[PDB]
Amino acid sequence: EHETRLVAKLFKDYSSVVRPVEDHRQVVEVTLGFTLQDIVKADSSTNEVDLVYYEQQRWVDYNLKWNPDDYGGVKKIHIPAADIWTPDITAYSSTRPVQVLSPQIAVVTHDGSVMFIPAQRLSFMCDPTGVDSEEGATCAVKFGSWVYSGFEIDLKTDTDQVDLSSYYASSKYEILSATQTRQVQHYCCPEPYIDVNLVVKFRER
Amino acid sequence: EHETRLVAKLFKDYSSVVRPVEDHRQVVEVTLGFTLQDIVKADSSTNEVDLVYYEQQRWVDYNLKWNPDDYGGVKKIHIPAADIWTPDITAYSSTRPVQVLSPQIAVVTHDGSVMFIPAQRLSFMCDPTGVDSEEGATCAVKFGSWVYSGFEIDLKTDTDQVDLSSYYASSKYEILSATQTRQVQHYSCCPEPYIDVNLVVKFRER
Amino acid sequence: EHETRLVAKLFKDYSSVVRPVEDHRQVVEVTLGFTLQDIVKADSSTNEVDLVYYEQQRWVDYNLKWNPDDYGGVKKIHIPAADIWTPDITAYSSTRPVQVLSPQIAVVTHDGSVMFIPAQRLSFMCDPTGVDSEEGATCAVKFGSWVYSGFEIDLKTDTDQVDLSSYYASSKYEILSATQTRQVQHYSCCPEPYIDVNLVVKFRER
Amino acid sequence: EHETRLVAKLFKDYSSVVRPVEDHRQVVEVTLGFTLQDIVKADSSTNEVDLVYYEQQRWVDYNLKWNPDDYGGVKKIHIPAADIWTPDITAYSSTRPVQVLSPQIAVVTHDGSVMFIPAQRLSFMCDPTGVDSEEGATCAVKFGSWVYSGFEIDLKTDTDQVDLSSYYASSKYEILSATQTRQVQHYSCCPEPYIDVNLVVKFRE
Amino acid sequence: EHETRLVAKLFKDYSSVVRPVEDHRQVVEVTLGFTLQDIVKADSSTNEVDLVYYEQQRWVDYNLKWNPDDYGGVKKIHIPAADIWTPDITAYSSTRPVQVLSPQIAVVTHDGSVMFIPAQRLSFMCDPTGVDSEEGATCAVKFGSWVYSGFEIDLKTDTDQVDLSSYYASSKYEILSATQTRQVQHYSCCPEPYIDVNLVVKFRER
Ligand SMILES: CC(=O)C1=CCC[C@@H]2CC[C@H]1N2
Numbered sequence A: 001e002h003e004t005r006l007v008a009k010l011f012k013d014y015s016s017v018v019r020p021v022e023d024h025r026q027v028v029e030v031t032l033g034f035t036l037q038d039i040v041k042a043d044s045s046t047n048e049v050d051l052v053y054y055e056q057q058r059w060v061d062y063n064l065k066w067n068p069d070d071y072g073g074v075k076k077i078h079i080p081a082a083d084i085w086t087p088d089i090t091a092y093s094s095t096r097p098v099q100v101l102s103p104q105i106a107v108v109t110h111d112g113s114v115m116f117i118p119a120q121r122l123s124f125m126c127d128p129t130g131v132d133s134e135e136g137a138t139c140a141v142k143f144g145s146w147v148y149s150g151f152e153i154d155l156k157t158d159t160d161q162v163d164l165s166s167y168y169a170s171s172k173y174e175i176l177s178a179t180q181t182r183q184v185q186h187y188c189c190p191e192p193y194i195d196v197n198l199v200v201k202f203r204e205r
Numbered sequence B, C, E: 001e002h003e004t005r006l007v008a009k010l011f012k013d014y015s016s017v018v019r020p021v022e023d024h025r026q027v028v029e030v031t032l033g034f035t036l037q038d039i040v041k042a043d044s045s046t047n048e049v050d051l052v053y054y055e056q057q058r059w060v061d062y063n064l065k066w067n068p069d070d071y072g073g074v075k076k077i078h079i080p081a082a083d084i085w086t087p088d089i090t091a092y093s094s095t096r097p098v099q100v101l102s103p104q105i106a107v108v109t110h111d112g113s114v115m116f117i118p119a120q121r122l123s124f125m126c127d128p129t130g131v132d133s134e135e136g137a138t139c140a141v142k143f144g145s146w147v148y149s150g151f152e153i154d155l156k157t158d159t160d161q162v163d164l165s166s167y168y169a170s171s172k173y174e175i176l177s178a179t180q181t182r183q184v185q186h187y188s189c190c191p192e193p194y195i196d197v198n199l200v201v202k203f204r205e206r
Numbered sequence D: 001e002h003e004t005r006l007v008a009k010l011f012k013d014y015s016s017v018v019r020p021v022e023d024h025r026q027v028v029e030v031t032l033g034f035t036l037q038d039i040v041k042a043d044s045s046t047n048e049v050d051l052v053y054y055e056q057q058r059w060v061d062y063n064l065k066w067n068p069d070d071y072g073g074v075k076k077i078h079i080p081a082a083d084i085w086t087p088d089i090t091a092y093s094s095t096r097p098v099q100v101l102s103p104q105i106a107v108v109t110h111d112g113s114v115m116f117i118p119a120q121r122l123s124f125m126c127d128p129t130g131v132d133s134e135e136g137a138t139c140a141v142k143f144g145s146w147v148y149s150g151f152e153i154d155l156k157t158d159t160d161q162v163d164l165s166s167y168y169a170s171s172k173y174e175i176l177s178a179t180q181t182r183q184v185q186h187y188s189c190c191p192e193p194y195i196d197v198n199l200v201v202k203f204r205e
């Protein structure tokens, strides 16, 4: 009953369209990490490549905090990502809607730290020329906020190495390397824009 | 809690089915601009071509204005497009439903300026005959309000040049030219004129 | 402000599930018209043909009337089709769910007249045999109410000549002719007539 | 006016999650009937076959009754199927989610009689070998409640002969025969018997 | 009347986002078992296989208990899966969103025991090399909670032997053997163990 009471209280006046910072001049810092599971398909007739991965996202939500003492020792809740503010992290060169492969549930801890790890299949622009060689081919796709600038959302990675420890061992494609690198840029605008570049080098097995 | 109170205030009595003008005799002026990203696929057996692009849309919403000073200095809000009035900009010769490639969130400034930029994959009617020649092939598609006449929605482009600076350099198709041009049309259904922006693309295998 | 007040008042006690008539013994008269844009493909291996068109529907909704004078001169509103009653006009021999290619928004005038013009892509049962000859091929599909009798919904066309003036000029298929013909059907099952509009298309490879 | 009041009354305390019977110990009798319109496709590389048909369903809802005199003489209402209790009739050997071709609207008569006739496209497990011969091929698929046992939902047909009077006369396949036959089955999960209607079609090019 | 009354009481303050245990320190034990129906397709150019099956899930919901004597003798209710708490059982190596082939309705008994048996079509990562030989091919996929650890959701099977008694006998592929085996995994992201059931399928061309 404690958890049920916690959730109702937390979400009574909660807004999912407002960046969850105490002061609006503050940035929301989002840590991003990829676990690449499979290169399913590299289509040289359309230059689309298909990846399956999951994408760990972490940030702090100021308004989703509580003292576990007040609620039977409850330290975590599990909430549909749709009901909380989430960062709108988007692939910048997809060619199809990302397909979701996992339940869209975020795990929130009593200190407000959110963990959200959607599994995804992405088709993105990539010319696989060289994939049939020992050296392999390389491709890249950028991920970032669609509507928030670097003053509103800041992106970080914990490491520039993509997690390959769960890559499908019998994929049609061997992974040779995969990095995830933060990049800052300016344009019209006084404000920095941030993305994480996902670079993959791979070859037919 | 400033932004939260702002949003609750703005949307307490807001209706998304009502054109956002102080006076209904007034027209909503919408600026459209296309950013072409990739010609993914051209199908000569059905004469459908698939485009990936961003569509920049800008208009003013009369009822989404506020003074930053009364709300902690908040200057912009980010609202799902489904929750505000939007221009029903529609491709007139699509052959499949448009696929949405970005979050559907509109950015709204304190002066009521809305900016909404959906990325899309569109299949539309297009004969790619000649795409394998120096001259290439030429296709076009009209974008405009499906249900609002020119007395209700009017369109403007900032330039007739389509933005090609984000076009996929390794695309199977090279863009020779791409324009976006405002047009007026009449349809047998309705006595009033309707406005569209005609996207004309000339392209060729690389 | 006025339109918002109008809309609030009209849909306070509105039911999208009841036919919009003063008394239930009255019939709703729906006028249908097709504007055919493209035969995208004709599949010889399954005998399915894919059409892109938009379908003008008009009828009067008794409970959607107002005096513009009481509402700042507002002459019409734009309401999502899902929120008003609509005629459940359905193809009787489709092979896939219809794909929606336009916003689902109805236009309602102050005298209650509703205009709703969905753009659609439809696969239906059709044998393309002879499409590669000069005589061409002929196919047909009936449109009508799924759950309402002829005493509840009646169908009319303004003309039996389909609007072909917007047909895609570089389609893989030329349209030889297209008619939209009201048919009245009597089944032993029912005393009441059943009414459909028969879309007949003669076509061939360009 | 009258109808709007009838509908508000009927559904004030109605629940679409509760079998519509006065006595819980009573069974809901559902009459089931198929109208086969077309065999669209027969895929010999995956042994899937695609049917288009109308599925006629009929039952009584005890709580959707009224006297026409008390409501301006309205004798029928037309309600989204999702808003009333419906039998969860399911194909047991489909290989894709069934596609709905018609409006999901049920017609309820004042005596509580419900008529619901979804048109569907179904891909189901079927080996079309011999479809190119005079003998043709024969496939079958069961239809029944997914979660209600024979003690809760019973199925019946009015005839064992599938209705072929609407069959597409220029289909790639002609129907040699098509029957619909009530069956009782037991499944490993549950001790109660379950009811289905077996659709058997023999066809050829 | 009784059942309606019971359902209203059960769900007045029910939360589907809260694990249905009395004490939050308690684990929810979920029994899983697969019934394989068909290997539809095995794609050697992408190494994906398409499997049709249904998946029996059983657990106890602490808050969905009642005395049948208090409610006309009602012993079972039938509730859409989406309206109760359910374990988020997920295939860990799927390559397409899973397709649901059955109504999503859970059966709940008066002692709170829930039975939920979704039928599904799954594409998952699978190298069919050898499927055209007598030894056939072997693939595996793990099923488990996505967001709940072994301290919150545990899994059990009744048997390691997968139910093959309903397998389609005219499938393009035959199943030589199939096992379902409980396992415990550890991830770097999270300090707690996670439970899965590993489905292993050996199969070949018929
Ligand atoms: C009001 C309405 O639906 C329309 C008005 C004219 C413009 C195009 C063609 C038909 C449709 N969209």
Ligand SMILES: CC(=O)C1=CCC[C@@H]2CC[C@H]1N2
Residues within 6 Å of the ligand: D145, D146, D147, D187, D189, D190, D194, E054, E107, E115, E116, E117, E118
């Ligand atoms: C309760 C339930 O979902 C079921 C009960 C038995 C009938 C068929 C097979 C498994 C499933 N549907």
Ligand SMILES: CC(=O)C1=CCC[C@@H]2CC[C@H]1N2
Residues within 6 Å of the ligand: A054, A107, A115, A116, A117, A118, E145, E146, E147, E187, E189, E190, E194
């Ligand atoms: C919390 C969450 O979403 C997850 C937790 C660990 C178990 C697996 C791997 C990552 C993801 N699912």
